[PDB]
Design a protein around this ligand. Structure first.
Ligand SMILES: Nc1ncnc2c1ncn2[C@@H]1O[C@H](COP(=O)(O)OP(=O)(O)OP(O)(O)=S)[C@@H](O)[C@H]1O
Ligand SMILES: Nc1ncnc2c1ncn2[C@@H]1O[C@H](COP(=O)(O)OP(=O)(O)OP(O)(O)=S)[C@@H](O)[C@H]1O
Ligand SMILES: Nc1ncnc2c1ncn2[C@@H]1O[C@H](COP(=O)(O)OP(=O)(O)O)[C@@H](O)[C@H]1O
Ligand SMILES: [Mg+2]
Ligand SMILES: [Mg+2]
Ligand SMILES: [Mg+2]
Ligand SMILES: [Zn+2]
Ligand SMILES: [Zn+2]
Lengths: 97, 364, 637, 84, 699, 66
């Protein structure tokens, strides 16, 4: 929920996951997220919804979006001897989804 | 739809849907007001039944004294009372409540490069305080017009609310209902006389989950809670049951959490680090308008008197860990910031799920 | 002259004549004021001219006048205030400001919250409970200006009124500030002969525990007048009784032309600070004579120290020495202020560390409920600015001001810190100054301030391995720095060693504790939770007013009495004992949980003084010193 | 009101893209999604503002395009497309 | 009319003015009358301010009562309505002003020659008017009655410069003392120091005294009281008074000539002919003992005008006596209810709880106390042992703390290079050795002592911040804790807990006595001449003999060298030494005072004035003490080189050690009030340095 | 409000109207009551004016007092 610095009027934006409801969310550079984004896509792939409690707004937005993501292995090169969990910074529950 | 509103809908009843993002404070408008002339002391009353107008005094105090034009008395004792001579007598005037709401189009269907569009709405009397921000509503109202002091003759649209319909009703302690009808009261008594009520309740818990009968029994026990004790020395004994589910991935513990979230009258499903924009435990931030401290939200507080389902319980922040510990045991959350100190209720049962290290659980 | 006004005045005369308590209260105020005036004449304080009125008594006497007071206070409160002024003037003729009215009792539908305040309650007397968030600067308001004309050598005056002064509206006659007399001579203002009445505006927001968890809060402005000024600080829980008023014209005039609406506020008649859990308002209880006699007859007994201690938390098995330490901390010792400004501590700090599920958090929650000014904090939840202070900016002046942290808010009080081990080092070194120097020094950008932080601290910590180990070094077990260890007066290691008889006894005690029913409650009915808001003035279940072990409401009457009344003084017979025990502890060969410094000596003095406070003794005795000395030995061995 | 800028391909290299305000009337509202390239035919006219511009020190007028027509430079299937 | 009705007040301004006039000519305290001799100095341009003491008026009333004549209570009337009595006293003074014995020369002030020209102009207009009226002879007709009517008509016709435009003095009311009020059974609410809590609306217009700490002081600015305009058309000077924060300038002339004429001249304002007051706005804050339980300290605005400017500095704990006056309302218009007013204190008198060392002067009354302290003998030990007498022992620590208070000789070289005279002391030891008590004792003793915490005082709380001052409407640099302790002592508790940025700030402070800030806000160097007293713990928290004293002291060598004295303070348990501490502490807790009755502690004010007189001294060193110091430094360097490989090392001796020895010797010479440094002072400095670290660690 | 203050007067128009009503039905001067027979003539369009004599009211008050 953000306030426009000129209009002084608040807007609720669901983000890319909510906006792609009944659609497709295309995430480039999947390995380079911060913690807040990782929690957001974790919640979206877990229960297909996004819960927000900010600025007096307590609600749940539908996030039934298919996700196509692109990522790079650690070190810039994939290693065949190591398995998939070691090749990415992605933790196992987000790889399972 | 909000963006399909047109000039053809002006001054007509429109039915429209959206999400409410802000509700203002209640203003006081005059319905009946008794006015008295300043020097003339002529007494008049004004009755207002129309509160539809915004940024306008469609009914106001008269610009000159009404005693002369009436000529009510035979004596009629050039005397001019002056412009705006009337004074409102407040102790004999009557008032109602007016509320400003803001309706936004739902964020699921918004163009990608566009800011979502919103409308200012007005409600009065019994239509006020019937909806909180975040609620998805259908609204019947008059698409109306005001001028705000970008085009020589441009008016900002607004809605005079005639009816509010809440599509779904959020669950909390304040919105909880305690009243029960006689037929459901008797029907629930026929449930308790069944000797196999335990078995049918356990089978009703997650029917599409195979196995885990002991976990389903523990979920039945968790949903009921226990008897809470308040002692003469003041030491409070909790009755809510907290259950942890540790295990390998793909074993339907997250589905059990989701089912408990669905079946519980009050329930919040979050991760260990919280939600995308809803935190865990309790968040005390400042009011966006008045800069005063208020409780923004949090999983353990919004589900007071209910169940908090914490998935991925192992991964958690440090402040959330101590808040979760206190809120499990004492069923309260202590908040001590530089502005506000309080102890607030978090009387909720915790159902947590987690995975062990190195992937699967190791017997060694 | 209005006839119905006079009839209402006569009816309130009849009510005041019937109930003689208000007649005695007016006279008691008058004798206090006249005695102070006579003391100022021969060789101080003055009481305001207002009377607390019970609404229930008025309802029993006259239901019509009571409903008039509640529903139309503008037509009923001024006649009653006129009646009270007539009574006080009739009695004060033998030995000038008109008398005011305050209201107490049940309000029914008028007991509201800032969210529940609506426009149907306008022009009605309402009682509103909430939290004070903002308070304005106290500003004088000119009521009568006095001027001097030097040419004629005469004094003139002009009276000023505004709409907030009167409940009934009046024709607004704005009389300008006179600089001429009627003949054109220059007037000079006579400051000091003019009268200025103090004026304040506060904001009362609904309480964060009575507010919905996700919504933005609702608030209301309250205007306070001369004697109601500065009865609140921000953060207080309050109950304000006053008239919900509408003011001015809500844009209906031509000059105004906007939808702020009619501006609404409460003209406060009464402000009650309320004691809530973990707030800055201290709990106080009105002591009757019978309670004082009960406290004094318990004071003469020999087992009073082992009676109050076991009656703190009887629902907790064991921890008998910890209950004694909590009682002595609640007594709190005597603070010394020397002639050169040097300060000496009086209050006692207790650290508890040990195994989980040992009722440490339950003891913290008990001290939060039973102490007058206890504030509960957590380890990582609170921060450095959370406990000490912070700097913000107010809207009007634009200059920086201070927001008081938990330690400053708990001045002359109790801080209960849970999860003491998980705290950040910045907040630790903040706490080093608080626990010994008893002050908080803020040196920020532009501001340099010293705040009082005279606090008792209870801390609950855990060992770094999660469980205490006997074979390991206790310094390795606690792993807390030496300087923090020295600050705490008593450190208690609570291990969950298990024995068959002890586990049997604790199991029986907890099982018989879970089989309790409150009086007046059915067997199957659930106990309801009502949040305790107490007015601040100025294992056996059946404990009923000191049979064997005292009740918690009586025990904090005893603690309050011992704190206000007795200030015990150290004597030689206690001094010899504490000196000998301090020397023995300094030169002991044994290993101790707590290190031994000169702080242990002052700990012995504080504990002896606190035990003397239990006995209501003005002198500290040898028996006080020996029990203070062997209480310390348990916390060390 | 629609903000229209010069398409970045047509802009000369060192120069910045110019922009105009285009006023769309009753039938022309919401035909152009932001981020799409269109051709607008309309009357090029001046905005009238009180006391002109005090910052410049010159009697300088702002300009707009009152759009007579909008032409653009959809997952709807017909009955024949379903058969195909 | 009935619009402004009259009221009868007990005050009468006729016999009060006559009482004021008779008081100023007949008050002979016990050359001639006091205020008549003071007005002679005022007329001779040697005195700028007139201080009216209410003690003098009370004594005058006592003498009038003993004579038997009836006198009005002038003290009480001044106390209730001081704003009127300022103008009454100014009128009385202007009525009886002695002629100046001195003549005006070219070295006088511009204001003095302006006022002299105005007085000469007034005399010339009076003489010209009476001369032309005599030239009329409009009756051709009792000489003395004719002259009386003549002066009556002449003083009524002409326009003169009023006495407000011919006054060269400022008038202030000194409050009556409590001690003098006790003698006559007078109850002085004016004397009683109030907190900011207790200054309510009923104190408005009264002369009251407030005690508190000064937090903010604005810069001195010219506030115009009356504006002077010149008219080219008529030649008049038009003056308009100003009593608000804003004014509207006059455009058309309003003199007597241009009022009647059809063509009005245009007024041009002149700064030199207009009247200004030196104006300062200050904030006073409640002391910590004044603040009630659980409350935040409040602040009061003080208006300082005239001669009293620059007498208030931030951090000073003061008694400010002034007139409590209302001001026009500042704030939101919607929030105001009726005739709301702001408040301020128009300052009249300032008393310092701690007297500044630079303000010390050798008055007569100071000299006998200094001679008494000297003739008592053993001054060094007496002053050292009386610093924190509730703390048992630590005699050498208190000796170095006294040398910290006094300091050494600040050195200026003709090349411009500077060697600091301030001494820096570190007190590092085990917990519970009362080092925080010693810092608090020193840092209340010193007049400009600022107590800080390791993490409670941040970097911006130490150095500076670029803040806007709204009353003067300018962005100014506002100092931190080190600026507040300038030419004082900065009192840093928990020294090892500080972050590295504050360590760099004090690193620049400790030697160069400056702070160089080059940020986005500011590019300055500012003076931070603090002597630094630091308190610290070892690295493990408890000292252990297994580690080297360099190892368990987490202090870099460069920051170690800055400290002139570092005291290791070991808490070593013993049966005999702990018992003396125990009896000392128990006696202090029981009788609320010090055990040993064989010596009387010096009072902090007496200690402050003796230290001030010591700081006035400027000792120098001779050849023999220089040779002894050189030999001692050589021995110290060789000894440190020997100890370097061993565990006994306390660092490496540096030239800073030599300069610290010289500084301590000069401080010890200052305590003896000698202009030279002796052998014994150098030996005492050397033994202090040796027992600071080596002696206690050896034991 | 204070613009039209109330005053207390000895006259009460409730028991005076009830006294007037009882006077018109029970005053039998010495067919049936006087003003009741007069109102019959008024109702029969035979009489146009009603004359209230204060002597009758004085006699009525005397009989009520006796
Ligand atoms: N016994 C079961 N019966 C039915 N569906 C099951 C069962 N076990 C797993 N599933 C399905 O497997 C999918 C995985 O969901 P969950 O097992 O709930 O995730 P989870 O691995 O338990 O949670 P984690 O540990 O955070 S990845 C869901 O679609 C479940 O419906
Ligand atoms: N020699 C002493 N004489 C008198 N009181 C003492 C002495 N040593 C210690 N104390 C007391 O013991 C307590 C120690 O408090 P502090 O002044 O904080 O000591 P400390 O040296 O600062 O310890 P820290 O802060 O952990 S380094 C105080 O109450 C002192 O008054
Ligand atoms: N000695 C005891 N007597 C009675 N109850 C106890 C005792 N020890 C633990 N409990 C119970 O066990 C529960 C665990 O909470 P608690 O022991 O306070 O946790 P912790 O000791 O980790 O703070 C509490 O509700 C408390 O009532
Ligand atoms: Mg899962
Ligand atoms: Mg615990
Ligand atoms: Mg200390
Ligand atoms: Zn009129
Ligand atoms: Zn002129």
């Amino acid at each position: 929920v953000r306030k426009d610095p000129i209009t002084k009027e608040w807007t609720l934006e669901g983000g890319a996951l909510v906006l792609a409801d009944k659609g497709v969310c295309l995430i480039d550079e999947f390995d380079k997220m911060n913690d807040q984004d990782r929690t957001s896509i974790h919640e979206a792939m877990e229960q297909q919804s996004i819960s927000i409690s900010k600025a007096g707004i307590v609600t749940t937005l539908q996030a039934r979006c298919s996700i196509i993501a692109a990522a790079n292995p650690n070190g810039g090169r994939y290693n065949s001897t190591l398995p998939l969990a070691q090749n990415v910074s992605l933790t196992e529950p987000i790889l399972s989804r | 739809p909000l963006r399909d509103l047109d000039s053809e809908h002006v001054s007509k009843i429109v039915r429209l849907s959206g999400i409410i993002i802000s509700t203002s404070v209640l203003s006081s408008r005059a319905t009946y007001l008794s006015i008295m002339c300043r020097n003339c002391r002529h007494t008049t009353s004004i009755t207002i039944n129309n509160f539809n107008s915004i940024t306008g005094n469609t009914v106001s105090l008269p610009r000159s004294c009404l005693s002369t034009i009436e000529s009510e008395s035979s004596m009629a004792n050039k005397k001019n009372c002056g412009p705006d001579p009337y004074i409102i007598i407040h102790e004999s005037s009557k008032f109602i409540d007016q509320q400003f709401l803001k309706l936004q189009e739902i964020p699921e269907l918004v163009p990608v490069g566009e800011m979502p569009r919103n409308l200012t709405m007005t409600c009065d009397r019994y239509l006020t305080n019937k909806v909180i921000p975040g609620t998805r509503v259908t609204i019947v109202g008059i698409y109306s017009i005001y001028n705000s002091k970008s085009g020589v003759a441009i008016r900002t649209p607004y809605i005079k609310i005639l009816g509010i319909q809440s599509d779904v009703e959020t669950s909390s302690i304040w919105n909880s209902v305690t009243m029960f009808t006689e037929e459901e009261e008797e029907e629930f008594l026929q449930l308790s006389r069944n000797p196999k009520l335990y078995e049918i309740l356990t089978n009703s818990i997650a029917p599409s989950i195979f196995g885990n009968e002991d976990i389903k029994k523990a979920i039945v026990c968790l949903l009921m809670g226990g008897s809470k004790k308040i002692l003469p020395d003041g030491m409070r004994l909790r009755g809510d049951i907290n259950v942890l589910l540790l295990g390998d991935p793909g074993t339907a513990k997250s589905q059990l959490l989701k089912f408990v979230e669905k079946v519980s009258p009050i329930a919040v499903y979050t991760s260990g680090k919280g939600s995308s924009a809803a935190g865990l435990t309790a968040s005390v931030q400042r009011d966006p308008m008045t800069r005063e401290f208020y409780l923004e939200g949090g999983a353990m507080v919004l589900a007071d008197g209910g169940v908090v389902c914490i998935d991925e319980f192992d991964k958690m922040r440090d402040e959330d860990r101590v808040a979760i510990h206190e809120a499990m045991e004492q069923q309260t959350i202590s908040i001590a910031k530089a502005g506000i100190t309080t102890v607030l209720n978090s009387r909720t049962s915790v159902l947590a799920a987690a995975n062990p290290i190195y992937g699967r659980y190791d017997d060694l | 002259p209005d006839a119905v006004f006079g009839d209402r005045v006569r009816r309130f005369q009849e009510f005041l004549d019937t109930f003689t308590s208000y007649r005695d209260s007016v006279r008691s105020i008058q004798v206090y004021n006249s005695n102070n005036a006579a003391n100022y004449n021969d060789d101080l304080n003055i009481l305001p001219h207002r009377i607390i009125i019970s609404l229930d008594d008025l309802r029993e006497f006259d239901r019509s006048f009571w409903s008039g007071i509640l529903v139309e206070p503008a037509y009923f409160i001024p006649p009653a205030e006129k009646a009270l002024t007539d009574l006080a003037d009739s009695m004060d003729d033998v030995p000038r400001h008109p008398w005011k009215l305050s209201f107490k009792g049940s309000f029914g539908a008028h007991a509201l919250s800032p969210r529940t305040l609506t426009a149907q309650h306008l022009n009605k007397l309402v009682s509103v409970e909430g939290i004070v968030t903002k308070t304005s600067l106290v500003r004088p308001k000119l009521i009568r200006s006095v001027h001097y004309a030097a040419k004629t050598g005469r004094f003139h005056y002009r009276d000023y009124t505004d709409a907030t002064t009167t409940l009934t509206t009046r024709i607004p006659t704005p009389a300008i500030y006179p600089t001429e007399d009627t003949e054109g001579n220059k007037l000079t203002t006579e400051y000091g002969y003019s009268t200025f009445i103090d004026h304040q505006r506060i904001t009362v927001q609904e309480m964060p525990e009575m507010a919905p968890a996700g919504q933005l809060p609702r608030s209301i402005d309250v205007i306070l007048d001369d004697d109601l000024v500065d009865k609140t600080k921000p953060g207080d829980r309050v109950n304000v009784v006053g008239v919900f008023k509408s003011l001015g014209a809500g844009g209906m005039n031509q000059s105004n032309s906007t939808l702020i609406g009619f501006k609404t506020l409460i003209l406060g008649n009464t402000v009650y600070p309320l004691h809530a859990r973990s707030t800055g308002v201290a709990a106080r209880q009105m002591l009757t004579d019978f309670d004082i006699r009960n406290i004094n007859k318990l004071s003469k007994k020999k087992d009073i120290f082992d009676i109050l201690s076991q009656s703190l938390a009887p629902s907790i098995y064991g921890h008998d020495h910890i209950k004694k330490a909590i009682l002595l901390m609640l007594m709190g010792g005597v603070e010394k202020n020397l002639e050169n400004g040097s300060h000496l501590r009086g209050d006692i700090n207790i650290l508890m560390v040990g195994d989980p599920s040992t009722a440490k958090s339950q003891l913290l929650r008990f001290v939060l409920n039973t102490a007058s000014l206890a504030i509960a904090t957590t380890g990582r939840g609170s921060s450095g600015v959370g406990l000490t202070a912070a700097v913000t900016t107010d809207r009007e002046t634009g200059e920086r001001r201070l927001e008081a942290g938990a330690m400053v808010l708990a001045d002359r009080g109790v801080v209960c810190i849970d999860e003491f081990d998980k705290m950040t080092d910045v907040d630790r070194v903040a706490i080093h100054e608080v626990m010994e120097q008893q002050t908080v020094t803020i040196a920020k950008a532009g501001i340099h301030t010293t705040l009082n932080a005279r606090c008792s601290v209870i801390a609950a910590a855990n060992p770094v391995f999660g469980q205490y180990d006997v074979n390991r070094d206790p310094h390795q077990n606690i792993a807390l720095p030496d300087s923090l260890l020295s600050r705490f007066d008593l450190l208690f290691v609570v291990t969950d060693d298990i024995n068959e008889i002890r586990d049997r006894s604790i199991s029986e005690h907890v099982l018989r504790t879970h089989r309790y029913l409150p009086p007046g409650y059915l067997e199957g009915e659930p106990v309801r939770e009502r949040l305790n808001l107490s007015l601040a003035v100025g294992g056996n279940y059946n404990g009923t007013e000191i049979p064997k072990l005292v009740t918690i409401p009586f025990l904090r009457k005893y603690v309050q009495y011992a704190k206000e009344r007795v200030i015990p003084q150290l004597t030689q017979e206690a001094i010899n004992v504490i000196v000998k025990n301090y020397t023995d502890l300094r030169n002991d060969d044994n290993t101790k949980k707590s290190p031994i410094t000169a702080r242990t000596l002052e700990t012995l003095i504080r504990l002896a003084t606190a035990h003397a406070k239990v006995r209501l003794s003005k002198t500290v005795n040898k028996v006080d010193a020996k029990v203070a000395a062997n209480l310390l030995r348990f916390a060390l061995l | 009101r629609v903000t229209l800028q010069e398409a970045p391909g047509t802009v000369p290299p060192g120069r910045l893209p110019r922009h105009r305000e285009v006023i769309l009337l009753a039938d022309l509202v919401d035909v152009s999604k932001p981020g799409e390239e269109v051709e607008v035919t309309g009357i090029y006219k001046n905005n009238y503002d009180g006391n002109l511009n005090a910052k410049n020190g010159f009697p300088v007028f702002a300009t707009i395009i009152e759009a007579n027509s909008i032409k653009r430079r959809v997952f709807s299937w017909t009955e024949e497309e379903e058969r195909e | 009319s009935a619009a402004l009705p009259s009221i009868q007040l007990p005050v009468d301004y006729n016999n009060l003015f006559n009482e004021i006039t008779d008081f100023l000519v007949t008050f002979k305290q016990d050359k001639g009358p006091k205020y008549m001799a003071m007005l002679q100095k005022v007329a001779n341009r040697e005195l700028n301010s007139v201080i009216i003491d209410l003690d003098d008026i009370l004594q005058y009333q006592n003498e009038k009562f003993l004579q038997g004549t009836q006198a009005d209570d002038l003290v009480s009337a001044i106390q209730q309505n001081a704003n009127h009595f300022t103008e009454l006293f100014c009128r009385a003074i202007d009525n009886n002003m002695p002629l100046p014995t001195k003549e005006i020369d070219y070295k006088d002030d511009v204001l003095d020659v302006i006022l002299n020209q105005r007085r000469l102009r007034n005399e010339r207009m009076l003489s010209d008017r009476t001369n032309e009226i005599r030239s009329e002879n409009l009756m051709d007709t009792p000489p003395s009655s004719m002259n009386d009517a003549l002066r009556e008509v002449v003083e009524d016709e002409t326009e003169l410069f009023p006495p407000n435009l011919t006054r060269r003095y400022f008038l202030y009311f000194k409050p009556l003392s409590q001690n003098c009020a006790r003698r006559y059974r007078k109850k002085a609410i004016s004397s009683k120091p109030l907190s900011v809590r207790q200054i309510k609306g009923d104190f408005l217009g009264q002369l009251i005294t407030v005690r508190g700490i000064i937090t903010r002081v604005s810069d001195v600015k010219p506030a115009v009281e009356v504006i002077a305009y010149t008219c080219d058309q008529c030649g008049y000077e038009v003056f308009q008074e100003v009593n608000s924060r804003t004014f509207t300038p006059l455009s058309e002339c309003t003199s007597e000539e241009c009022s009647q004429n059809q063509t009005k001249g245009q007024l041009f304002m002149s700064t030199r002919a207009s009247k200004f007051s030196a104006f300062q706005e200050c904030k006073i804050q409640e002391l910590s003992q004044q603040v009630p339980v659980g409350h935040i300290p409040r602040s009061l605005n003080i208006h300082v005008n005239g001669t009293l400017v620059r007498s208030l500095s931030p951090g000073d704990i003061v008694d400010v006596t002034g007139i409590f006056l209302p001001a026009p309302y500042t704030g939101f218009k919607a929030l105001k209810a009726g005739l709301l007013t702001e408040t301020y204190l128009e300052a009249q008198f300032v008393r310092q709880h701690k007297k500044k060392f630079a303000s010390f002067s050798l008055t007569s009354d100071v000299e006998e106390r200094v001679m008494e302290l000297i003739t008592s003998g053993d001054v060094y030990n007496r002053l050292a042992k009386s610093i924190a007498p509730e703390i048992y022992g630590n005699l050498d620590v208190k000796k170095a703390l006294l040398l910290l208070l006094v300091g050494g000789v600040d050195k200026r070289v003709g090349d411009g290079m500077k060697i600091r005279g301030d001494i820096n002391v570190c007190l590092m030891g085990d917990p519970g050795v009362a080092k925080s008590q010693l810092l608090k004792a020193i840092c209340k003793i010193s007049p400009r002592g600022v107590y800080t915490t390791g993490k409670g005082s941040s970097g911006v709380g130490l150095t500076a911040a670029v803040m806007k001052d709204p009353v003067t409407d300018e962005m100014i640099l506002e100092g931190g804790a080190l600026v507040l302790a300038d030419n004082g002592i900065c009192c840093i508790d928990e020294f090892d807990k500080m972050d590295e940025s504050d360590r760099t700030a004090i690193h620049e402070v400790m030697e160069q006595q400056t702070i160089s800030i080059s940020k986005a806000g500011i590019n300055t160097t500012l003076n931070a001449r603090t002597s630094i007293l630091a308190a610290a713990n070892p690295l493990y928290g408890r000292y252990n003999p297994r580690l080297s004293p360099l190892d368990n002291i987490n202090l870099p060598a460069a920051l170690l060298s800055r400290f002139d004295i570092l005291f290791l303070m070991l808490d070593i348990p013993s049966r005999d030494d702990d018992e003396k501490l125990a009896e000392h502490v128990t006696y202090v807790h029981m009788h609320n005072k010090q055990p040993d009755l064989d010596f009387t502690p010096v009072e902090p004010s007496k200690m402050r004035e003796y230290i001030a007189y010591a700081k006035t001294k400027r000792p120098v060193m001779s050849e023999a003490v220089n040779d002894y110091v050189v030999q001692a430094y050589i021995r110290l360097r060789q000894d440190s080189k020997r100890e370097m490989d061993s565990k006994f090392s306390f660092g490496q001796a540096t030239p800073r050690t030599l300069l610290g020895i010289i500084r301590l010797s000069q401080a010890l010479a200052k305590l003896r009030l000698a202009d030279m440094v002796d052998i014994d002072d150098v030996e005492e400095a050397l033994r202090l340095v040796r027992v600071s670290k080596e002696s206690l660690y050896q034991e």
